[PDB]
């Protein structure tokens, strides 16, 4: 069987090469580059007392949740910097947080191997844990709400999972990753999603089917970050080998590599602009980088963090970027 598997791998590689007519640089070689993105810190969200491991923007593009090792999940009004909620976690070892698209829920998880769903809109005035999603045998690296009742979680047990929050059961387990799965990105229509794992592979999953539609392997090290392109036909990955890559779902390729020679630190988080022209990637070298997603050159830098930029996200309206970092501050850029 191993010989057949290597033959099939060779067949897929040749089929991928048969579809690689012209690189994305050559096709985009004529577009006017974006000049130089002068994003400035419009807000600094202070209040976390440990490293920030995750943030997620609300779909209203004004609220964002963040998770920190200080055991708190804080919801911010980024317009006013007002803290809407501060949710104390049972486990301070939180690595991920998701904000429900309805805004009625946040999720968080980490070394406790549990995704906790928090009811933001309770009849009592408190945020309570609505569901504890047990079943992962490793830490949770990412979680993303499909809706109020469905959530996909990636884990260090090398499996992503789809959950039914009402029942708390893994409605679908997405096995196939050999290394720790570090990230998810739901497709904009949420009919499919990508996950990046420590086996340096990005797998396109079908939520309804439960099967791996495609596997994307161009990185040399662990993929810490993954993000769909806004139209859902591409995604970008950020790995420990100091490079980002843009993969296309339909071409089944690695279109573009976002790397710099003096960048040697790994990428903690990647995100796209509303038009998707900018790939904003957070780095271990304390500063986020703005990339021209189509020409693979740094448009700008979001320097401004005193430690590793651990998380970032661009608002659904595309107005602002929030970067959390291990220096315990969230900074809204614009």
């Amino acid at each position: 069987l191993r010989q057949e598997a290597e033959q099939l791998k060779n067949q897929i590689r040749d089929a991928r090469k048969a579809c690689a007519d012209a690189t994305l640089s050559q096709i985009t070689n004529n577009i006017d580059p974006v000049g130089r993105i002068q994003m400035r810190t419009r807000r600094t969200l202070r209040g976390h007392l440990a490293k920030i491991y995750a943030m997620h923007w609300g779909t209203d593009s004004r609220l964002l949740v963040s998770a920190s090792q200080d055991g708190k999940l804080i919801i911010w009004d980024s317009y006013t910097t007002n803290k809407v909620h501060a949710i104390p976690l049972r486990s301070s070892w939180v690595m991920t947080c998701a904000y429900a698209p309805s805004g009625n829920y946040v999720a968080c998880g980490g070394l406790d191997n549990i995704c906790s769903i928090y009811n933001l809109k309770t009849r009592e005035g408190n945020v309570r844990v609505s569901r504890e999603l047990a079943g992962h045998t490793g830490y949770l690296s990412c979680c993303r709400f499909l809706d109020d009742n469905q959530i996909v979680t990636s884990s260090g047990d090398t499996t992503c999972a789809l959950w039914d929050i009402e029942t708390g059961q893994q409605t679908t387990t997405f096995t196939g990753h050999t290394g720790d799965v570090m990230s998810l990105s739901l497709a904009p229509d949420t009919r499919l999603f990508v996950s990046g794992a420590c086996d340096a592979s990005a797998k396109l999953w079908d939520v309804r089917e439960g099967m791996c539609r495609q596997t994307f392997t161009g990185h040399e090290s662990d993929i810490n970050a993954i993000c769909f392109f806004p139209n859902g036909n591409a995604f970008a990955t950020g790995s420990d080998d100091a490079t980002c890559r843009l993969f296309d779902l339909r071409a089944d390729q690695e279109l573009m590599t976002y790397s710099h020679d003096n960048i040697i630190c790994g990428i903690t988080s990647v995100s796209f602009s509303k038009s998707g022209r900018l790939l904003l990637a957070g780095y271990d070298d304390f500063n986020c980088n703005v990339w021209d997603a189509l020409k693979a050159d740094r448009a700008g830098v979001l320097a401004g963090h005193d430690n590793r930029v651990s998380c970032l996200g661009v608002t659904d309206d595309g107005m602002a970027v929030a970067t959390g970092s291990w220096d315990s501050f969230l900074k809204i850029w614009n």
Partner: peptide, 9 residues
């Protein structure tokens, strides 16, 4: 698989 030309476009 589509072409990378069509994908990039």
């Amino acid at each position: 698989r589509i072409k990378v030309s069509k994908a990039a476009a």
